[PDB]
Amino acid sequence: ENLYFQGASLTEIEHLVQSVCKSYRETCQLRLEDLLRQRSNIFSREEVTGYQRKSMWEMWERCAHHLTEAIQYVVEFAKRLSGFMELCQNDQIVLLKAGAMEVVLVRMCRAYNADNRTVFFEGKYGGMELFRALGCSELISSIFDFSHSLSALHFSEDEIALYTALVLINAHRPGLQEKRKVEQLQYNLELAFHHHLCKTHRQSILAKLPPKGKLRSLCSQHVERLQIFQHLHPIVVQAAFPPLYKELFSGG
Amino acid sequence: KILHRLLQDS
Numbered sequence: 312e313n314l315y316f317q318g319a320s321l322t323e324i325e326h327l328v329q330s331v332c333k334s335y336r337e338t339c340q341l342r343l344e345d346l347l348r349q350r351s352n353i354f355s356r357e358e359v360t361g362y363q364r365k366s367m368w369e370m371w372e373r374c375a376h377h378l379t380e381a382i383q384y385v386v387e388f389a390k391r392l393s394g395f396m397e398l399c400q401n402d403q404i405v406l407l408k409a410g411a412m413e414v415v416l417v418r419m420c421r422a423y424n425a426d427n428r429t430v431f432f433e434g435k436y437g438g439m440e441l442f443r444a445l446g447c448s449e450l451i452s453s454i455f456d457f458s459h460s461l462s463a464l465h466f467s468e469d470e471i472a473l474y475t476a477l478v479l480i481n482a483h484r485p486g487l488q489e490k491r492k493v494e495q496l497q498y499n500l501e502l503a504f505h506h507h508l509c510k511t512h513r514q515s516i517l518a519k520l521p522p523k524g525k526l527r528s529l530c531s532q533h534v535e536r537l538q539i540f541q542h543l544h545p546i547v548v549q550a551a552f553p554p555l556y557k558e559l560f561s562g563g
Numbered sequence: 564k565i566l567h568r569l570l571q572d573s
């Protein structure tokens with residue numbers, strides 16, 4: 312079904328590095344050059360106050376829409392990833408349901424300015440205080456800390472491409488029917504990532520990558536906070552949250 | 564419903 316479902320040669324691994332990097336470059340929601348250029352564009356005290364005065368429901372709605380927009384780009388990244396479209400539909404959905412948010416959390420570090428602890432949001436950079444109306448301070452703080460930690464690694468765009476391919480192609484996700492096929496694709500993407508690091512003298516980052524369970528903890532906290540919000544504003548979720556967001560995080 | 568549509572949309 313795909314070359315990468317079996318043992319790949321060095322030259323095939325080299326091709327895989329190029330294919331993954333190309334898939335990522337074509338499916339960025341935000342260009343790195345744009346994010347870096349916009350760093351001087353920061354929300355004023357007045358603008359921050361405006362976001363803080365928004366109702367909890369209006370802020371949750373906006374943030375769910377922005378997350379859904381990011382997730383759509385991750386779905387396109389998946390579709391372009393060597394071997395992904397050759398997996399069965401059940402496995403494609405299992406991997407995206409479990410991994411789409413994890414990939415967005417990783418992609419976020421590009422939009423995060425470690426210099427002043429701000430993130431690009433609705434056209435300007437703002438600190439975590441911009442999100443205070445959500446009423447999930449702990450989760451926002453944890454996501455900022457995560458982006459801060461990833462920012463300290465100074466990832467290149469190619470490293471992000473290969474690392475996020477692996478975040479998505481995880482053979483341990485519960486529910487995978489063709490687990491052996493996913494294990495082999497994961498093995499080849501792992502080789503592609505480690506080969507690129509070896510070639511660029513960046514193998515030192517391997518021991519510095521987030522631990523096993525860190526991305527899972529942030530994803531579980533998101534679902535928990537959404538369930539709290541849903542109990543408070545059930546019709547906001549039913550009437551005004553994006554259908555894709557609900558399919559991923561509230562079981563439809 | 565959505566994920567199936569996005570995956571099927573070529």
Ligand SMILES: NC(=O)N1CCc2cc(Cl)ccc21
Pocket residue numbers: 373374375377378422430431432433442
């Ligand atoms: N850029 C963007 O859409 N972001 C950055 C930070 C952030 C937090 C939440 Cl809750 C939703 C979206 C976003």
Ligand code: NA
Pocket residue numbers: 420421422423424425458462
């Ligand atoms: Na960053």
